[PDB]
């Protein structure tokens, strides 16, 4: 993998692994969550762990996290799949356009996918800046 991404993971696993026993337990998660923001219900915590075959050492940890962030394209690769509809090369897409593309073209999105997506989207002046949004969605 990558270093800097790891350095955090560990220091993280540390703050999460409250009972400082080098393992993450239903009580470990529940514990720290509450010390900050609302925490998940038993069912959430349960299936949240079942996501890891055996005990949660800093290994099966980095394992499931890495298998999440796997299968992703570059910030360059995406910024282009975008400029592929930015004929004039203005570095912006007209909102009605993009919304139209995603909504009923190719692998049609859904209203929720649609809302979830634009709830964040950086649109101001009719034009949806796909650069700033490619970053936000990436690094």
């Amino acid at each position: 993998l990558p270093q800097k991404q790891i350095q955090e993971m560990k220091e993280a696993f540390s703050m999460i692994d409250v009972d400082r026993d080098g393992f993450v337990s239903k009580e470990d998660i529940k514990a720290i969550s509450e010390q900050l923001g609302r925490a998940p219900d038993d069912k959430e915590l349960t299936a949240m762990l079942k996501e890891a075959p055996g005990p949660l050492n800093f290994t099966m940890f980095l394992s499931i996290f890495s298998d999440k962030l796997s299968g992703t394209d570059s910030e360059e690769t995406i910024r282009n799949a975008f400029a592929m509809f930015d004929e004039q090369e203005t570095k912006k897409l007209n909102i009605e356009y993009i919304k139209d593309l995603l909504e009923n073209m190719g692998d049609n999105f859904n209203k929720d996918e649609m809302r979830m997506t634009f709830k964040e989207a950086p649109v101001e002046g009719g034009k949806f800046d796909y650069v700033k949004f490619t970053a936000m969605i990436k690094g």
């Binding site: 009923n104 073209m105 190719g106 692998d107 049609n108």
Partner: protein, 152 residues
């Protein structure tokens, strides 16, 4: 029809059926452009005859019903160089292979199965057709390009 050509229908059917929402069905209003991609250039009168529609939404079609639309639009007549040269001559009073931009425009937009004003400025710019000082153009050249293809 040749297996290879059915595979080709397949190839293109996808690019399309995908763009109007991938689901293994194509808007009958595109059946024209589909075949226009496999070389052929049917006439709107032609397309509707097999199943085409005036608007989107009207209806979608599978690849099963698509095969015969293309079997159909194949046996339909295409124009030779002779024919395009003949017809264009009837607008030349001089007889020296000329015409004016303005008139050519009229022929395309006003006569026969009309052509929008956009497709015109389009193909003009594409084929990069140019007029002289008097504003005339050699219709012989033009016909040759259009006949040529977008990539010669």
């Amino acid at each position: 029809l040749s297996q290879d050509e059915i595979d080709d229908l397949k190839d293109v059917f996808e690019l399309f059926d995908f763009w109007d929402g991938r689901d293994g069905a194509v808007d009958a209003f595109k059946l024209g452009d589909v075949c226009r991609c496999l070389g052929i250039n049917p006439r709107n009168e032609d397309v509707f005859a097999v199943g085409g529609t005036h608007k989107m939404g009207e209806k979608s079609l599978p690849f099963e019903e698509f095969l015969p639309a293309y079997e159909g639009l194949m046996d339909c007549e295409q124009g030779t160089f002779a024919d395009y040269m003949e017809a264009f001559k009837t607008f030349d009073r001089e007889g020296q292979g000329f015409i004016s931009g303005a008139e050519l425009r009229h022929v395309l937009t006003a006569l026969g199965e009309r052509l929008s004003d956009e497709d015109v400025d389009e193909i003009i710019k594409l084929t990069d057709l140019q007029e002289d000082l008097e504003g005339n153009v050699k219709y012989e050249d033009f016909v040759k390009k259009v006949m040529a293809g977008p990539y010669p």
